[PDB]
Amino acid sequence: MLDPNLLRNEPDAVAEKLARRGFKLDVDKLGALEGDIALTIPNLPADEVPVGKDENDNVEVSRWGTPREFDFEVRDHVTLGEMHSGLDFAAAVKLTGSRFVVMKGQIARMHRALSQFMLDLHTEQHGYSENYVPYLVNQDTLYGTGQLPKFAGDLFHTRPLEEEADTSNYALIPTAEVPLTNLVRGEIIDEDDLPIKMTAHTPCFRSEAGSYGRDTRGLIRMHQFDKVEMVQIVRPEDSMAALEEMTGHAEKVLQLLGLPYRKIILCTGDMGFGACKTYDLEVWIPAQNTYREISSCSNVWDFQARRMQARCRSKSDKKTRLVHTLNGSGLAVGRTLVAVMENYQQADGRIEVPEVLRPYMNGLEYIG
Amino acid sequence: MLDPNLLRNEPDAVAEKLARRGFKLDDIALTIPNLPADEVPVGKDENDNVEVSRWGTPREFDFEVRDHVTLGEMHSGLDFAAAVKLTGSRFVVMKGQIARMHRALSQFMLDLHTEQHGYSENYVPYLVNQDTLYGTGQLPKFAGDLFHTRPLEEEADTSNYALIPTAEVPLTNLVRGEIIDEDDLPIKMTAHTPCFRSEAGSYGRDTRGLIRMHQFDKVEMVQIVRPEDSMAALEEMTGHAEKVLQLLGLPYRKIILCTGDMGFGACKTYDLEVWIPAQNTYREISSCSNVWDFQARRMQARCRSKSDKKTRLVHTLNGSGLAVGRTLVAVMENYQQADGRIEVPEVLRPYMNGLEYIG
Ligand SMILES: Nc1ncnc2c1ncn2[C@@H]1O[C@H](COS(=O)(=O)NC(=O)[C@@H](N)CO)[C@@H](O)[C@H]1O
Ligand SMILES: Nc1ncnc2c1ncn2[C@@H]1O[C@H](COS(=O)(=O)NC(=O)[C@@H](N)CO)[C@@H](O)[C@H]1O
Ligand SMILES: [Mg+2]
Ligand SMILES: [Mg+2]
């Protein structure tokens, strides 16, 4: 949520910034500001974020690598996965329903190897601490990171357990951002212990409400996908620099795997609810002849910290202030598997195993 | 479910075998447990289970033994209070080197079963539909043991899902409705998944630590085999789970469960129990079961001889190799040192970047 003092003493400045991201603040209602409307207001954009309406106004910052030229017919990841009996979408319908998958054999092992390579890289070289977290969370946690009240329909919710004294309303996590960031809920942190850098590998569950029609086949858009998440808790004055550092950590994954990509900064109209600034990384997908989002890295400013009342304290004076939080994908594992399968395919239908993954796959050089 | 021909032609024989496991046989067919195998000892509860063998000797300590919760807290590696804040009781947050050892355990097990024991690795959904739960027997009788999700408003009729209590459920259902060539058997599958259990009627049982949780990781083994091979396959599969404990240098004992302590769907179960120093006893770390044709009948999973065209029901088997949270308990307590550090078992060091000690 936003600083209530800014809504008091500068309703004009605030309503204008929010207008740049397409949100009209009822000034009349703004004075009143009752109920939970304060919890439905998105974060203020940083000054340097380009103004725009939708994704067509996003701005490319840089890119790395050149898409490979194919002298044979380019096959998509579903065709490749099914001809090696490694992806089975029909079995997933039988077990559960649509937008789930079963992976088998060498392709399942490559999916596992990707998550292990990412986790090792961030913990051994980038200074992140590894965490194993619950995949179910409670209402206070979802309010803390902003998923509630506005995005309840994006989540899977559990029913109450048939028991005496059980009244648990849990939701499945849509991203490890939720549990990791809430680890500092209600804490007051010594400024000398900052930054806190955490990573986790979790499944992620999303209803994908109102996304039907788009990406109907394949691994791009699923109800369940694996993701290695990075989160940082930092001093307010360090957060813009930490965003550059964290985005670089995600780029390093793509570079070591040899995947061409581009980095874009989102405009005001395309940013997510809680971010004040976001870089997306988009990886080359040969069969779609374009770049597709593979990571989103955001500075959240003090927006989550205020809901969570997570504060830091200086060593000189005992005064406290809100920390800043950041999160970013490093990376979404399912979409990385898509990019590896299509970019490393060979003319005979085999898939070359990227060099850095071979130690995680018992030396295997080719799939198939 | 049981063979309906058998209930017709031999109600006496059937009602007697079911009596052994404490079930009085007067959609209702789906509430009847499996028939115990002849070699299973008759008994009422876990006091009548029978020890079969042991391997290794518990280590003798010349200092006071610390439990895994104390050890987890001194290394800032297990944090139960943070889990209550995020979610509720019976959850845990693991951090740092303890989290990495938990991950390394699952990778070592998966690599062993796929590289040496001939199992095929699978990534599966952690939500399943009701037909799948009926197939492996969790429905209709054990709905209360599960977390259920509310239907998605845009898939309102087809999204009554539940979180899996074990990868047995999705893996075994991969052959639902199939006819398999006998030459393609046995089918050997493994998976590493989280497991979710309501733990109803268990308030008080192991209230401290990692032994009993709402969420835990497990590496599961499943086999689909010809009906005449299933008792041999149980011995093979139980030995796959034993090899994990042996390579980790963990003392254990193997018991066979009596009729009265067996699970709903098993006809024969070996449990493996691992030595837990701070409890001065063995605790269950794996359960390996022959399920006979009980699940195959609900699923109509069949096999065909190449000679003729007749089909018959396959047999199915499942076993833990292993439950990862409880293995972490065993490794932490059996390898602790006097200063509180924890020796990393030799076989895990390649999965922990060469680390020799925690702490
Ligand atoms: N339904 C989905 N199926 C597969 N992958 C997805 C799905 N939704 C998102 N992703 C992947 O996960 C990444 C992170 O998702 S995000 O919502 O944009 N951002 C977050 O969740 C933040 N916590 C940063 O990780 C996306 O960039 C995309 O690569
Ligand atoms: N609530 C729990 N918390 C932690 N570990 C558990 C819990 N319940 C069971 N386990 C572990 O998981 C193992 C397998 O559980 S089981 O119900 O007995 N059997 C199965 O699920 C079969 N699919 C074989 O794996 C147990 O032997 C025990 O080691
Ligand atoms: Mg995004
Ligand atoms: Mg049991």
Side-chain angles (χ1 to χ4, degrees), chain A residues 190-214:
Chain A
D190 230 287
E191 255 180 20
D192 281 342
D193 295 328
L194 297 172
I196 294 163
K197 293 153 84 143
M198 303 173 285
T199 190
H201 167 222
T202 76
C204 300
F205 305 90
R206 295 187 187 192
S207 76
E208 288 303 317
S211 289
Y212 268 92
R214 292 183 182 174

Side-chain angles (χ1 to χ4, degrees), chain A residues 199-303:
Chain A
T199 190
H201 167 222
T202 76
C204 300
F205 305 90
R206 295 187 187 192
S207 76
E208 288 303 317
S211 289
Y212 268 92
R214 292 183 182 174
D215 312 300
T216 69
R217 105 199 220 92
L219 296 177
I220 298 296
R221 188 175 306 283
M222 311 236 84
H223 284 311
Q224 174 185 318
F225 65 97
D226 281 19
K227 177 166 62 52
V228 177
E229 182 79 349
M230 303 171 292
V231 168
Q232 295 204 18
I233 320 295
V234 309
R235 295 164 47 211
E237 34 275 311
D238 296 337
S239 68
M240 282 307 183
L243 178 62
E244 304 296 329
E245 176 194 291
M246 182 177 68
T247 305
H249 291 153
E251 298 182 62
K252 179 63 100 140
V253 178
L254 293 161
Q255 292 178 8
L256 288 170
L257 290 165
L259 302 172
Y261 68 91
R262 64 199 250 231
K263 169 158 61 169
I264 65 172
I265 181 158
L266 305 189
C267 67
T268 55
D270 201 45
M271 258 186 301
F273 179 77
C276 75
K277 187 179 174 182
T278 301
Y279 296 114
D280 281 13
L281 302 176
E282 302 179 335
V283 70
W284 181 252
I285 305 298
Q288 305 179 27
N289 198 236
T290 191
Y291 294 89
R292 292 301 298 277
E293 188 192 331
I294 192 160
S295 169
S296 190
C297 292
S298 299
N299 190 350
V300 180
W301 211 247
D302 59 12
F303 186 86

Side-chain angles (χ1 to χ4, degrees), chain B residues 64-202 204-357:
Chain B
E64 191 150 285
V65 151
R66 288 180 186 98
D67 77 347
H68 71 275
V69 171
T70 299
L71 285 165
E73 281 176 9
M74 10 188 308
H75 298 288
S76 293
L78 299 179
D79 188 340
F80 291 91
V84 170
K85 174 165 83 173
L86 297 182
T87 312
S89 55
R90 309 270 228 189
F91 287 89
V92 70
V93 175
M94 303 183 199
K95 310 167 107 169
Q97 298 175 319
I98 296 289
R100 165 77 106 122
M101 187 161 73
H102 183 256
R103 166 164 68 100
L105 282 164
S106 75
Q107 302 302 297
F108 157 70
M109 298 166 183
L110 236 27
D111 288 355
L112 180 65
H113 296 319
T114 60
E115 286 168 15
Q116 323 259 259
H117 297 154
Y119 290 86
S120 184
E121 167 173 0
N122 299 263
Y123 176 93
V124 295
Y126 306 156
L127 296 162
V128 297
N129 65 33
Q130 312 234 127
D131 296 339
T132 297
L133 291 168
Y134 272 100
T136 36
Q138 288 74 26
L139 292 186
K141 182 176 178 183
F142 307 94
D145 294 349
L146 309 172
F147 291 91
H148 305 260
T149 54
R150 308 201 136 96
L152 297 185
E153 83 137 353
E154 291 188 358
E155 298 177 25
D157 275 321
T158 59
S159 67
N160 297 292
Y161 297 146
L163 289 161
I164 59 171
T166 164
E168 164 195 347
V169 171
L171 287 177
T172 308
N173 270 280
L174 285 176
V175 298
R176 183 164 96 236
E178 296 291 337
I179 300 169
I180 303 148
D181 235 72
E182 238 171 38
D183 284 334
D184 296 332
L185 294 172
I187 291 164
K188 289 153 84 145
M189 302 173 281
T190 186
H192 167 223
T193 77
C195 300
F196 304 90
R197 303 193 179 189
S198 72
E199 285 305 314
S202 156
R205 297 177 183 175
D206 317 286
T207 63
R208 146 192 205 81
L210 295 176
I211 300 295
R212 190 172 305 287
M213 309 236 82
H214 285 312
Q215 172 186 319
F216 67 95
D217 283 18
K218 177 164 58 50
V219 175
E220 180 77 356
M221 303 174 293
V222 169
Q223 299 202 18
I224 320 293
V225 307
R226 299 170 57 241
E228 36 272 316
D229 295 327
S230 75
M231 284 304 184
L234 179 60
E235 300 295 334
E236 173 190 304
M237 180 178 74
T238 306
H240 292 151
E242 288 183 77
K243 177 73 81 159
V244 181
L245 294 162
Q246 286 172 14
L247 282 171
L248 286 173
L250 295 171
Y252 66 92
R253 58 188 244 232
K254 175 164 63 187
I255 81 199
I256 183 159
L257 304 187
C258 69
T259 55
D261 199 45
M262 258 189 312
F264 183 74
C267 78
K268 182 178 185 189
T269 302
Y270 295 115
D271 277 11
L272 300 178
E273 311 188 330
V274 72
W275 181 252
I276 300 302
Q279 291 172 36
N280 212 37
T281 186
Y282 294 87
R283 296 298 302 268
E284 187 193 327
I285 190 153
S286 175
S287 199
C288 301
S289 298
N290 191 351
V291 176
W292 209 249
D293 58 13
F294 186 87
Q295 288 170 337
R297 181 170 292 105
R298 300 184 168 216
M299 299 187 306
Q300 284 301 306
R302 289 145 291 166
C303 61
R304 199 203 292 274
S305 42
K306 186 179 177 180
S307 97
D308 75 65
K309 280 190 171 171
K310 291 156 94 199
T311 57
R312 55 195 178 122
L313 295 174
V314 300
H315 289 186
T316 62
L317 298 91
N318 60 86
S320 334
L322 309 158
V324 184
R326 291 190 179 185
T327 308
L328 178 62
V329 171
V331 166
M332 285 178 70
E333 289 190 6
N334 280 279
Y335 280 84
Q336 67 184 282
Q337 311 290 289
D339 56 349
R341 289 184 314 153
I342 300 169
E343 185 189 353
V344 173
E346 191 91 59
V347 84
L348 290 188
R349 291 179 185 179
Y351 295 94
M352 297 197 71
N353 196 27
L355 197 77
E356 275 160 20
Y357 289 81

Side-chain angles (χ1 to χ4, degrees), chain A residues 39-73:
Chain A
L39 298 172
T40 63
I41 301 169
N43 200 0
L44 296 174
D47 289 326
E48 70 267 34
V49 167
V51 178
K53 313 237 151 158
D54 58 20
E55 73 252 52
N56 292 116
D57 301 322
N58 295 339
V59 173
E60 176 177 314
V61 173
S62 54
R63 48 169 75 158
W64 186 91
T66 291
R68 152 177 187 200
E69 284 173 57
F70 289 97
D71 56 333
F72 59 86
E73 189 209 344

